[PDB]
Amino acid sequence: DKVQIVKPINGDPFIGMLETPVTSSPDVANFLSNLPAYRTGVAPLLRGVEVGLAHGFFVTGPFIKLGPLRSTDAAELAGCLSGAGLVLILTACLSIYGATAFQREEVVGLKTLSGRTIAKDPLQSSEGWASFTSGWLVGGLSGVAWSYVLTQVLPYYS
Amino acid sequence: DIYPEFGTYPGGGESPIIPFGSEKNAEREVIHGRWAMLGVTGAWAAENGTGIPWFTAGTLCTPDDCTAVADKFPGAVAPLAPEGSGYPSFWNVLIIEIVLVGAAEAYRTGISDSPFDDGLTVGDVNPGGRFDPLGLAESGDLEELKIKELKHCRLSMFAWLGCIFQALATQEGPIANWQSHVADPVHSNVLTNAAKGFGFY
Amino acid sequence: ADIYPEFGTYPGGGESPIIPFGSEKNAEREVIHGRWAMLGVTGAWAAENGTGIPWFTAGTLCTPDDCTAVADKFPGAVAPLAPEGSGYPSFWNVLIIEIVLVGAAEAYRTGISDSPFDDGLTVGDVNPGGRFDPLGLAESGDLEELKIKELKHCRLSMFAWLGCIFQALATQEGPIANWQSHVADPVHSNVLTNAAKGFGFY
């Protein structure tokens, strides 16, 4: 009876957020919660692994199909080396972020929307972000190499 | 009076001619009636919409060239499966039927646990709850609805027996025989065909 | 039951959903009918493997006038059944011997005629357990279980004989001939393709 959909964040109307079908829908919430970044109980290294694999896999494609050597027969090798170089740059960015970002105490805790007190993400720490960066590097290079393999292997690739 | 035709329903009374020893027979004849109801109706409708006998309808769909049954249904301008695709396949239909009817029979008769969670005791031929989307049993009289169904059950089984023995005598089909009997009642009956010899004598 | 897993049940094991068990004489009748059916289905199995004649046509080979054809029908036989020169298994000869032997056995099985043996053999018992079981297989084996085996074979073979008679009436081809046609191509050789052909009448 005259249902209103959009509600404040966790019922508190004094926080800078609103819960909408884009934010708090069950399908959206389940998808995001199942992504590796939001698996806070898992080791940061393995989350970084999957992240790197996914990211390094796709990021190669723009360099393959739109790079300077896209017309040449070496288009794929150039694009994959470009992707590997970008993975190395992003590893540098991750290393510097991990060195600088986690310098404060952050005395305030974290809870779920149900109100359950939970521990902080080990990813959100200097050494945890270092492990995540290493996982990113391994995953990104493996994903770039896999993209090269698939461009050389996949039947309907052109 | 209720059920004054001949004899009495299994729910109340005794058979005039049989002892009714086993209580499995009651629900057996309910299921047999319902199947016959669908069978007789099928034989009624097929030979109207297609003109083929129900007993030779099986020959249309065979493991080779089952495409004959495609588009046989009245209206239904799209065939069962597109022409030239040859996808009306006796084995495909048979397997789909085996799995669907076998699962339905297992659910009904307790070979497998019922998938649902709402009552539905095995062996009752009047479940009601899940099998009344329209809610006609609670609105109407349950007992007399059940008696009507039984009358239909026995009527349709007798009609099916008549259909099979007509098929054996005249070799033509139920509706074509009905039309021949209607057109010339004196000159199209069982005794007339007996005077012709039933097609063998 | 645990032992009897077939659709129905054995008399004394319980009660059948359809046509429940009445008189014990019905159970005796079932066992004896089975026994003769086992013999009959085996005969219809072996004879046309030996010589190719369906069992429903094997009767007319012997006739009151001529019964030479039945002689030398058994495969592997060292000699003719009666002299090669003049076979003498005439239908009357067969009859006169067989009616006396079968009538004796029957009356002595049922005890309408005084038993010859009088070895304690009690008529109206399907399992005599006397000279009929010289090996006494029942004594070593478990008699309840063995009774169940006997009844399972009884019902199977009686059903097989029903199949033989109805296959004769539909296809008039022969039991093993029907087998060989079905193994040749079951999809295109079965009851329903013979129905499409019309069972030879339609």
Next chain:
Amino acid sequence: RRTKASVPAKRSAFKANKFGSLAPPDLYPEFGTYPGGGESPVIPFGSEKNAEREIIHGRWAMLGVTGAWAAENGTGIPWFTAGTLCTPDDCTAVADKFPGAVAPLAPAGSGYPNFWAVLAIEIFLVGSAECYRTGLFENPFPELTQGDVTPGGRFDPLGFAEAGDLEELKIKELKHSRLAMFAWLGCIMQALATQEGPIANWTAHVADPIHANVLTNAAKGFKFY
């Protein structure tokens, strides 16, 4: 994301209703005995693990015997030469080997099962399962016990184990297992002696039963004397 933790209340698509035991009270009247129910007739019981080893070889040999049977019935190729079809080179042929297959493993043209592709999938799938079955890797299903040949949780979706008598079903499987392993041994020895497939040997033995036996082929030396 909030914690729902509702009640699934799902039932099996098929869940066999109680059917109990369909076997006599005597369970191994055959030669020998099931493990844990008597003394081994001939060979010594090597170890407690040997029972589970027998079960695994049995199930694998069942699957192998049925595979050779169906492959020879559907293609006519003997099982011992079916390996030569899919190779690092020309594994395209192995595709269309299933009678009635709506589609080929190898679509017409280049599209095809590669040996290395098939192999890499085979290692990654079968080895994973093999490890998860045994103490290797870990246990992804804690509710089941690694090292048990009869887990009977998710591995019996139809629930025949609980529907019937469990131990009679177990011995039934064991008897099928031993039968199929001995049949598999017969198949390999027949392949060695006659160089023809199992169903080919069967057909030769049933067409003329009196000849086409061990001793008939021995009269020719199994094509070696």
